Every structure is written in C-alpha cells, then in structure tokens.
C-alpha cells in the first residue's frame, strides 16, 4: 500500500518519528556529488532534533571517512555511519570472542582490515595476490598464515585464482569462518553504470568451499543488529529511507521500521509495481510505505 | 540398472553387443600422468578385437591432438592411418563446436575467452577469432580506471573455462561485453571443484562461470558433462548408435548421467572418484534424478577387462 508521500504527509511522520536512517548513494549522493537539497534537509532535521544514522553495504570506507565525506558534503555531522566493514568486525569480535590471537584472511579492501584490527582482529590478505606457479601442485604448495580463524570476503579488486585457492585453503580447516560482507550481484555506479558486486566473489568461495556464507550487509538482519547496539534503535519511532527495493526497504520491513522509497536511485516506480503484484509475499516485503522523488522533498515540512 | 558386477563372461556379452566405447580419461584411463595399471594393454586389445574408441573429458587445457599425443605415449594407441579420424572430444574442441553453431552466418566473430590458450587454439580451427587469454592484472585506483580500458569491437561471445589467471578486471570486462544483448556467454563446465591426485582439489570452472552469470544477470550454456552436447559433439564426428555403444566412467553425476541420459550402456569404474557406496546411496531415492545416475555395470578397472578380450 505505498503512500505517495506530500509536504503534509511528511509532517505527520516526521511527528512520529525520532531516528531516521538512511543509505548514502542513490539517496544521498551520487558518486561525490550530493542530491539536489539533501545536505540542507538532513541539517535541518538535526536542527529539528532528529537522530540520523547511516547504513551502507560497501566495505570501502571506514566509518570515519564516511563520516568526512558527509561534512565536506554539507550534510553535517553528529558516530552515525554503520558500514560492513564496522559491521563485519563486530560480527568477527563476536563469533572470535574465545580465540585468543585472532586472525583473518581477508579478500577485501584495507578499510574492512582496519575496522578488523580496532576490534582486535589481525587480517592477511588485503592487496594482490596474482598468480605463481605453472600448476595445482604449486598454487596448493604455497605457504599459508597460522592461526587463521576466519575468511572476509569482501569488496576484493584484486580477487584472482589464488585468493580463491587460499581461500579454500583456509576454510577446509571446519572452525574457520566464511563471512561475506554483502551477496549484491552489481555494484551501482554513476550515470546507470554498474560493476561486478561482492556477491559474485563470495558464491564463487561458498561453491568452491561447498559452504554456506553468513551475510553481514543488507538484506540481513544482522546489519540492523550492529546499528541498534548503539543506537538502541525503536522501531515504532525510526524510519529507514533507500534506493534499493532487495537491500534497503526490505530490511526496513523485516525490522518493522518505517519505510520511505527515494527515487533518486536504482528502484523506481515500476519495480514497486511488479512487486505489488503477488507473485510471492516477499515481494510484497520489497513495496515501500512511503515515496519520494528526493529527500529535499522532506523540506517543505521541515 | 541394478549395478552388476561385470564377471569375464558378462563382460563378453558386453564385447558381443558393443561396437563403439567411449572413455573418460581421468579416473579411468589414468591418474594425473600416471596410468592406471593395465589400462593400456585393454585398449590396445580392443583396438586389436576392432572396437572403436572414443575419449570424452571435461578439461580444456589441451588441444585434441596434444590428448592423442598422452594417449600414445601413455601405450593407449591412436588413429590408424590417413583414414582414421581424431578420438579425443575435450570441452575446448566441442566448446569451439558450439561457437561454430551458435555463430554461424556471424561475419568474423571474436570471442573474449577466460580460459586456456588450448581452448583458442580450437576456437581458431572452428574460426572463432580470441581476445583475452592470460593475465589482466588490476590497475587503476578506482571503478573509472577499470572502465576506461577499451573493448574489442564486435565481441559476440564470452567463453568461461578453467582460467587460473581470473581476475576482477577479467569478470568486468566479460560483464561490458555481456551487456549487449546478442553475445553470448559459455561455459565449459559448471563443476564446483576440480579432482586432484590423493584426494585432493582445487576451485573448479564453476565458480568462474557462476561470478559471470550473477554480475551479467545471465544463465550460461555448459558444454561439458552432464550436458548433452558433448555427447552430440561426439557423434557428429563418429556417427553413434546409442544400443551398440557403452559409456566408461568413473563419476556419477556427470559420466553416468551422460551414459544414461543419451541411452548408452553405462559401466563404473571405481578408480576414480565415485564409490559403491554412492551408488548405494543413490540406489536409495532421495531424488529422482539419483535413480537416473546409476550404472549398468561395474568394475574396479578397465584391466578387468583384460581376460574377456584374450
């Protein structure tokens, strides 16, 4: 039953609500450039009182960097970013809570290795790894870290034969862990433009390893789990505004947080019909409460 | 279909019936470089009793005539004379097959190929032209970099085979290319591990090809076993008729499913990698596809053959 949202509408929920969460590209932002009237609203709801929060799926940046691109965009500033790579490291401090020296092969960026090593996690891993040796002997004569604990699949660039091999490697030992940081097929980019997503790398090691990853991003429930622990987050008063109908506004319905669709973004109108109609009910989970053309459309209540 | 243990005299009933056989190499055949012991000697007699042979394999580092090069070297023999045509059908020769097909009426197609230089050099006898073979280490700092590289012009297929040099720069190039609509994407196989010697393994071509198709959001096309068109790839050349030929194979969900799928009589051999067991648990139905992956006969190796051909 998705409300077009209007400047009175907007009145009313911003009454109910106190937490607003929000994704950052196609909502906010674009590439380095912010949505027309996006740092002016989210100032203003801070004036107005509001708590903003942050959830994205890319393992890229740490949290403080998200948090400077937001005050160089204008959007301001309290931390209030939760990403899978901070996610990621709670999960793996979490799950590693015994082991004593814990460490990490990680196909992921240098970010998602720094927010392992605050929570006390040492990782292996990040960077090229390209390929040496002219046949299986070799890629599986190739020495390994001890004690490792767990293999990150992350945003991995430099994913190449050998991380997958290493990979493999590691996760024939049944304590190791496979955590994966998001299961996107595309990466979106600017202008339409899109790239292989970290999904693609993860199924690739879960088919290999004949294993089952544990999904710390979007869709899971285990993303809205790291922001509530510091948020204490109420579902009744919090609102969660997106791009993406499979990541963003489903966790907004399966977390039962008020859900508001922005267009600036991959999904749009049509995707929202199609789910609409029952072809399953959890394509009904994927159809926003509320819809915006962008969140400058917030301002006229604001 | 009750798995038979094939005795010297069934076994005979099988040579009497049987014009054509068809192999697997790996786990029948030989183990890695090493020969399985007493194979030889039962091909070179089946060669001597008139038996045509044929090889089907699901790896495509190798060329058809490099095959025929290990077969002989390995004492399996080979062609006969000026007359006697090539024996081995390996997912590179039939995966050039299927582009042949797949492009005919395609002026001068191009082909971007994660996989190996075998598998182009095929594709160069079929005329398929190759881009992409080797190493595409990452450069750049950014998703700008990686797509600013240029693109070949008039690329109308994607073949994914075993690519130990698969890269990120390589799945995002296949992607740009898979974005327009008339190329196609292959698969050479969709096994998830690669069988090594002592039981151990490494990531098969399936992981490759299914990285492809979750970022191209696009289903590929598996030449190689279980998938009939390896068995069509034989027959083209050889002329089967599926009664009076046997299938000999060491996996069930892939040698034995061709064999029972394309009708032919299916013999297990346990040098490779299924066991009775499996059988046994597939014997029991847990699916309906198990009852499909069960064998006709079985032996522990092709040398059990031996006493039935002198």
């Given at each position: 039953r998705c409300v077009r949202l209007s400047a009175e509408r907007a009145k009313l929920l911003l009454a109910e609500v106190d937490t607003l969460l929000f994704n950052c590209d196609g909502v906010l932002w674009r590439g380095e450039t912010a949505v027309p009237g996006a740092p002016e609203t989210l100032r203003a709801l801070r004036a107005r009182g509001k708590?903003?929060?942050?959830?994205?799926n890319n393992s890229s940046k740490t949290r403080t960097a998200y948090a400077e691109k937001l005050r160089r965009l204008g959007f301001g500033g309290p931390l209030e970013v939760f990403g899978t790579a901070y996610c990621s490291a709670l999960y793996l401090r979490q799950r590693l809570a015994g082991v004593p020296d814990?460490?990490?092969?990680?196909?992921?960026?240098?970010?998602?290795?720094?927010?392992?090593?605050?929570?006390?996690?040492?990782?292996?891993?990040?960077?090229?790894?390209?390929?040496?040796?002219?046949?299986?002997?070799?890629?599986?004569?190739?020495?390994l870290e001890p004690d490792v604990r767990a293999v990150v699949v992350g945003f991995d660039p430099h994913f190449s034969y050998m991380k997958l091999t290493k990979a493999v490697r590691y996760l024939q030992q049944p304590d190791c862990l496979l955590v994966g940081t998001n299961m996107d097929n595309r990466l979106p980019l600017e202008n339409g433009r899109f790239i292989a997503g970290t999904g693609c790398l993860v199924r690739a090691v879960e088919m290999a390893a004949q294993r089952q990853a544990d999904i710390i991003g979007k869709p899971s429930r285990f993303i809205f789990d790291c922001?509530?622990?510091e948020y204490g987050i109420n579902p009744e008063r919090t609102v969660m505004v997106g791009d993406r109908l499979d990541t963003d506004i489903l966790l907004g319905s399966t977390c039962s947080l008020k859900t508001i669709l922005t267009l600036t973004g991959v999904s749009s109108l049509e995707d929202v019909k199609s789910n609409q109609e029952s072809d399953s009910m959890f394509k009904k989970k994927m159809v926003p409460d509320f819809y915006v053309d962008s969140i400058a459309d917030l301002l006229p209540a604001l």
């Amino acid at each position: 039953r998705c409300v077009r949202l209007s400047a009175e509408r907007a009145k009313l929920l911003l009454a109910e609500v106190d937490t607003l969460l929000f994704n950052c590209d196609g909502v906010l932002w674009r590439g380095e450039t912010a949505v027309p009237g996006a740092p002016e609203t989210l100032r203003a709801l801070r004036a107005r009182g509001k708590r903003l929060g942050f959830i994205t799926n890319n393992s890229s940046k740490t949290r403080t960097a998200y948090a400077e691109k937001l005050r160089r965009l204008g959007f301001g500033g309290p931390l209030e970013v939760f990403g899978t790579a901070y996610c990621s490291a709670l999960y793996l401090r979490q799950r590693l809570a015994g082991v004593p020296d814990p460490k990490a092969y990680v196909l992921g960026s240098p970010a998602l290795a720094a927010e392992l090593e605050a929570v006390g996690v040492t990782s292996v891993g990040v960077g090229p790894d390209v390929l040496h040796g002219d046949g299986p002997s070799d890629w599986l004569a190739v020495p390994l870290e001890p004690d490792v604990r767990a293999v990150v699949v992350g945003f991995d660039p430099h994913f190449s034969y050998m991380k997958l091999t290493k990979a493999v490697r590691y996760l024939q030992q049944p304590d190791c862990l496979l955590v994966g940081t998001n299961m996107d097929n595309r990466l979106p980019l600017e202008n339409g433009r899109f790239i292989a997503g970290t999904g693609c790398l993860v199924r690739a090691v879960e088919m290999a390893a004949q294993r089952q990853a544990d999904i710390i991003g979007k869709p899971s429930r285990f993303i809205f789990d790291c922001v509530s622990q510091e948020y204490g987050i109420n579902p009744e008063r919090t609102v969660m505004v997106g791009d993406r109908l499979d990541t963003d506004i489903l966790l907004g319905s399966t977390c039962s947080l008020k859900t508001i669709l922005t267009l600036t973004g991959v999904s749009s109108l049509e995707d929202v019909k199609s789910n609409q109609e029952s072809d399953s009910m959890f394509k009904k989970k994927m159809v926003p409460d509320f819809y915006v053309d962008s969140i400058a459309d917030l301002l006229p209540a604001l």
